[PDB]
Design a protein around this ligand. Structure first.
Ligand SMILES: NC(=O)c1ccc[n+]([C@@H]2O[C@H](COP(=O)([O-])OP(=O)(O)OC[C@H]3O[C@@H](n4cnc5c(N)ncnc54)[C@H](OP(=O)(O)O)[C@@H]3O)[C@@H](O)[C@H]2O)c1
Ligand SMILES: Nc1nc(=O)c2nc(CNc3ccc(C(=O)N[C@@H](CCC(=O)O)C(=O)O)cc3)cnc2[nH]1
Ligand SMILES: [Mn+2]
Ligand SMILES: [Mn+2]
Ligand SMILES: [Mn+2]
Length: 159
């Protein structure tokens, strides 16, 4: 099974200038809980944005060019990325925009954080078709002293 996990600001914005400008510790904790002990697939730009391997996960990087770091696994196509995960119950696709576009048609589950924040971005999560997806979990949180925007954790499953 392939799942996508992402955090979306208003208008499906996910990034600006190869960064995420907000800081929501509760959402990073959600990301870690839902990805730990699973393979994670990311594009090269997202690898550069994170800047280090994510511990406790097999890190698989898509790039058309040879890898530059043997602490992670480098692959050159979607099918190779999936194969490199082996026989696991759930593969996590962690972006960015171009990678999400390619994996969306193959995904059964979306883990989405909806952040009540306006930021002028250059990368968006794919337009997906709402009729294709059932919301099976949602949990709303007001802003607090640690998290400066309200946010909603949602899990959707392909109908
Ligand atoms: N809010 C969130 O949830 C979230 C999550 C992830 C990322 N982000 C943000 O998203 C942005 C990065 O997204 P992006 O769309 O620019 O880049 P991306 O999807 O991270 O990376 C694209 C790169 O991945 C490689 N690639 C993708 N598909 C491939 C394929 N089929 N075969 C081979 N290589 C392939 C290519 O690398 P080469 O050029 O080396 O061939 C391509 O240039 C940043 O702003 C980041 O902060 C946000
Ligand atoms: N829900 C969600 N939120 C995100 O912010 C997110 N970000 C990315 C891409 N960017 C990043 C940037 C940093 C870390 C990161 O450092 N994660 C640590 C959390 C511990 C911490 O630094 O506070 C991790 O171990 O997973 C992960 C992804 C991909 N999917 C996401 N999915
Ligand atoms: Mn091929
Ligand atoms: Mn197999
Ligand atoms: Mn806000």
């Amino acid at each position: 099974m392939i799942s996508l996990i992402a955090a979306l600001a208003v208008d499906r914005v996910i990034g600006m200038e190869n960064a995420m400008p907000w800081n929501l510790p509760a959402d990073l904790a959600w990301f870690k809980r839902n990805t730990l002990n699973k393979p994670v697939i990311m594009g090269r730009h997202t690898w550069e944005s994170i800047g280090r391997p994510l511990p406790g996960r097999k890190n698989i990087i898509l790039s058309s060019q040879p890898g530059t770091d043997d602490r992670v696994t480098w692959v050159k196509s979607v099918d190779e990325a999936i194969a490199a995960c082996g026989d696991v119950p759930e593969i996590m696709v962690i972006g960015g925009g171009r990678v999400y576009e390619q994996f969306l048609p193959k995904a059964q589950k979306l883990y989405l954080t909806h952040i009540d924040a306006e930021v002028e971005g250059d990368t968006h999560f794919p337009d997906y078709e709402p009729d294709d997806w059932e919301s099976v979990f949602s949990e709303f949180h007001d802003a607090d002293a640690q998290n400066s925007h309200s946010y909603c954790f949602e899990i959707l499953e392909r109908r």
